[PDB]
Predict the structure.
Amino acid sequence: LRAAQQQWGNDFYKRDPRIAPLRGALATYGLTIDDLGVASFHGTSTKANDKNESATINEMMKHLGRSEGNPVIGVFQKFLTGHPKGAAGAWMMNGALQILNSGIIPGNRNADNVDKILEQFEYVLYPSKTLKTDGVRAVSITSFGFGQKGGQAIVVHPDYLYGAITEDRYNEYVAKVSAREKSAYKFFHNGMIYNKLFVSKEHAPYTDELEEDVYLDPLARVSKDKKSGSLTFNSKNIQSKD
Amino acid sequence: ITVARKYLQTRWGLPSGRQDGVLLVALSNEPAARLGSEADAKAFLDSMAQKYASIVGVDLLEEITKDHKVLA
Amino acid sequence: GVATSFSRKKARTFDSSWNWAKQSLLSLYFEIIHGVLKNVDREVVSEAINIMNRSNDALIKFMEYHISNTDETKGENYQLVKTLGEQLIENCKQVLDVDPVYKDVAKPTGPKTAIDKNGNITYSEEPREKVRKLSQYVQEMALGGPITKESQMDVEDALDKDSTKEVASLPNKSTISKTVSST
Amino acid sequence: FQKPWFATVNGQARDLATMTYEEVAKRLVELMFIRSTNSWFDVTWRTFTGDFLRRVEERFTKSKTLSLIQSYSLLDKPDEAIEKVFNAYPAAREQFLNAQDIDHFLSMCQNPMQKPVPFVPVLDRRFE
Amino acid sequence: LITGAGKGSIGAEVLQGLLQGGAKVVVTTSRFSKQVTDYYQSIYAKYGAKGSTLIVVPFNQGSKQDVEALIEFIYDTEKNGGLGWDLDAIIPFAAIPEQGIELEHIDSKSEFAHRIMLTNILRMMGCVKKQKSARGIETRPAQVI
Amino acid sequence: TRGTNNIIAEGIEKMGVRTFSQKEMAFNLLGLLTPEVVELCQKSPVMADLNGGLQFVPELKEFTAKLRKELVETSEVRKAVSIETALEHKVVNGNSADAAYAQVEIQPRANIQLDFPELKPYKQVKQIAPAELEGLLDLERVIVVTGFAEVGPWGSARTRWEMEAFGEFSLEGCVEMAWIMGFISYHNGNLKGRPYTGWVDSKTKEPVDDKDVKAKYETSILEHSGIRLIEPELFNGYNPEKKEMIQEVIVEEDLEPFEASKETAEQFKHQHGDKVDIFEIPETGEYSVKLLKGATLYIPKALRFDRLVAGQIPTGWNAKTYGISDDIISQVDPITLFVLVSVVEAFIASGITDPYEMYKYVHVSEVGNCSGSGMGGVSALRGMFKDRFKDEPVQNDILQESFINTMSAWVNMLLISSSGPIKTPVGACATSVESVDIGVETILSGKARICIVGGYDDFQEEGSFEFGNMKATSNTLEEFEHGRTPAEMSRPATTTRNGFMEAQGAGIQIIMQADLALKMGVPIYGIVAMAATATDKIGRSVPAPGKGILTTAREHHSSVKYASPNLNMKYRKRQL
């Protein structure tokens, strides 16, 4: 059943040459090319990069049939944080999630003047100020590195996931998440105040003399201990009929 | 290490193996930077020989010619 | 105070109206949708003027896409953006090939001082009772007052009532026969 | 015992950092406001829960405004007072007590010039 | 060319006008900052009409050398690092606030202020005259407000 | 003209004279530029009275002055009489009856929030996506982001987003920044007699109110985060202005002898041979070392460098305050501290408070770590190549910390305890996206059901210099020459973009199977719906950007007459 779900829901476009990866990526959630609202540019502030990246984003929109008049709105967060080589993609992946869940697209506040060259790329819009929109559906984090290390990632808004699940199930979920948030707000203000945020684990969930037994039972899972109250593997849950 | 013993012996009266104790106590308290003044280095050897003093339990002109001979 | 300040390398030049225009509009747009600008505010008229001041074959395809793609159904605010949008799209089509123009639409003001019942001196800038357009301001000027002795037209504005309607007016050249000089 | 464990909400055992601002205010009124005599058994205990509600306002307000509990006399109708505060700051019903306010609460329990609180707020060294 | 068009001034209101009409304008600022750079990018992205262009330069109307340097950078071919322009209007609104200075108080400040507000304005008109003239520009006067 | 002494404006006007707003005078002035009056000027000088009749009022000076006096007096008598009738009341009618009549102002405190995502009523949820979607997707193969955090120039994911999206901090902004930066420290106990519970200036140990944090600290907080001048304190003394470097010289005549240990004198003689003499000083047991003519010497010198600005973690950041043990602080490379702190903060963002809670839902072997670095351990690398070369004291396992995959190792050894996959990416300036690719795939192959994804790199002396040599980074001397403040030297897509600004930090996110996330009941911040890596083409310039990644848009349009039923969800759903 899972494989059928896979064939028709998840990977229907894998073996199709008329459906691009980018296309189908959005298509699985009923999203069109035009739905990709924001492009998180690598924006290195170098002459080489910024032009190339715009051109390449422009072309991937052009090829897939982006409606004339609907540009991608590009953010360039390197303007605020700088460029930490490796940590680049992640920072942009964060801002992308924050954009999705807030509907706010921040502005390249250091865009005194958009390079006149870039006018040709009619599928890109370079904002100098923050736009609070009524929704963002999908962001595109792209990044380039030395050695022809190119990469893209498409992040789609969370609420499209909940569409594919039963109402009773969704409701049950909201319940758990709510309880977590409360208990995490708890945890966080504790560790802030008392500098307890990082707490190094001084033991594994398994005793040394139980280590192997756990690695080998695929169904072995942790339970609260009575004495310690912390999460350990029990002798009675390892290789159990239960 | 030569000059530091002739100071420990001149100004704090320490023999062969007693200045060995003052150097070992200064090795556990070693400065995380090089001392600047020779007077800063003298003052360092002072307090180090008194931390040795209460860990062992004990309490506390030719130089004109020297400048000339150097010249010769 | 007489020390030097100018160097050529510190000059900053601003060019890209082509881009700020799409932004200018995509902003008026969310702002009406979010009801920061309601259809009464003069700002929608001001901003209309600035958007028209930058008609591209390209700026048009922008508003065209975004306006034609709004769901009027979604809310009362959505209809407004769409209607205004379409109106604006029309105007820009006309302006296309027309040199910009400086037209101030801001509400004209005058001085108002008031001293508290507790001696608190307060200054406001109030709208002039009998002045609303820059048009009316020119008329006020030409009449003078009684204090200038010896020598040495009604065009009802949709102004603070219906912005979209005034916005539709923007592209149209006013014809006048009763020259203000003759007042 | 005559001193219950404070952080027990409708029979449900739990800790002070796992109550909400509402639950605490309602637990405070529950244990200090004597229903039968429609009276706060001690003025310090009315004073206490006032200081607490004031804190609720302080935490959850965004900008600066003025207190909805201008005088603690308003606590003489405890239920009505509580609803007034939490109506204004509805969020306070859903969030657990801020970590820093726990310290505060437990500090008020240690205030001299106040009738010793009628419960145990904490299992710790001074539990005797 | 417009001097004295800082924020919150008759200058900046005239500047917004010019830009709205599609003018090509050089603005001088005395307090050249990020804070001030950011102001003008804001102003341009609001009123910068089709065919408009704003150029912000740091400037001190009190310096003879700045007056000369400025309008030279204006007339000099782009190749030579210039602007390649030819002015049609000059609005020398640059000034310094002298208050509580009476006759017998006139000193260093007022003499300097007089320089910015008169002598260097003359010098500035004089400068663009030489440029135009040295280029045979006899049919394109610059209007001085 | 009135603008940002107008108080008498209304009064002067009360005489049939007009005063003007600046927009009005500007309109008036602009009217002199109209073609009509321009040509007028060309015929003969024009004079324009834009003075609204104020040239008719006699004795204007004195008249003016009178208005001002009458106003000011009316103000001061009115305010003086009221202040006295008010004291007469406190006398006649007691100050305790008026004391219970003032209201109490309430002042805000900071309520930092985790800012989870919002879950709408299901009714509205099912309106977003097509009804056909329900149960179409194998949720075991939908990759979802569950948490995230960062350590960087602008604080954490919370404070940075605030600055990026809003440009100023909230109360929660400053209070958190002041905390991470070390300005304020929490205190609960007695403060000089009376009991206190709240923030304390850590330098002075005096109390600080939330509502004051801004006035007291932000001015400085702002000066010491983001892209700013390189603070040498943060980099073992790296001073771009004074670069340390030695030059080789040959000693032209015998140096003067110096005392040395026997072990040490022998290390010299081993090196120089014919070109050094060492002799025992019979009395002390130690040797004299005399460098002869011909020997080689290293004489230190200094170099002025171009890159003066970096995006650095806010000044006063301290892995100690996030709660990291001094032993770890010592043992580890700075970059591991960034990583450690974010892995913690990212689990918090996902509502996972004890990592071992994963092992309630999953098997030890199905939690993985795919975080990567471009260089990573640049600091231990130096201790290995340079600090050894000087015989400076350096650890015996700096080699450990120099590796890129050891950051992930300490994460697993201190926090996670997994036996899941451990694939570590090196992707230069894209290790982070490539990391997500690798992450996504590892979960889609059944090898992991939860794994840690992200990137990290540190800014150090030798790093910045080599970038400057590749001409890659922005030249700060040149940026200054152009009137550019440090906060302004990173301007992508700009006409004047001039090179990139270097920075430091880490950022990770936690990714998961949609199905597992739902079951655990963690937050869902987004769907990773695609991730790809692609090489470019034949070349010879390694640092060059290309269009390899354009291939993610590759579809074949050689036939597109009629609609593909495949794209149609209604179709697929029936088939399922």
Summary: Chain E has four helices and five strands. The first strand of chain E starts at residue 2 and ends at 3. Helices of chain E lie at 10-20, 34-47, 64-75, 108-133.
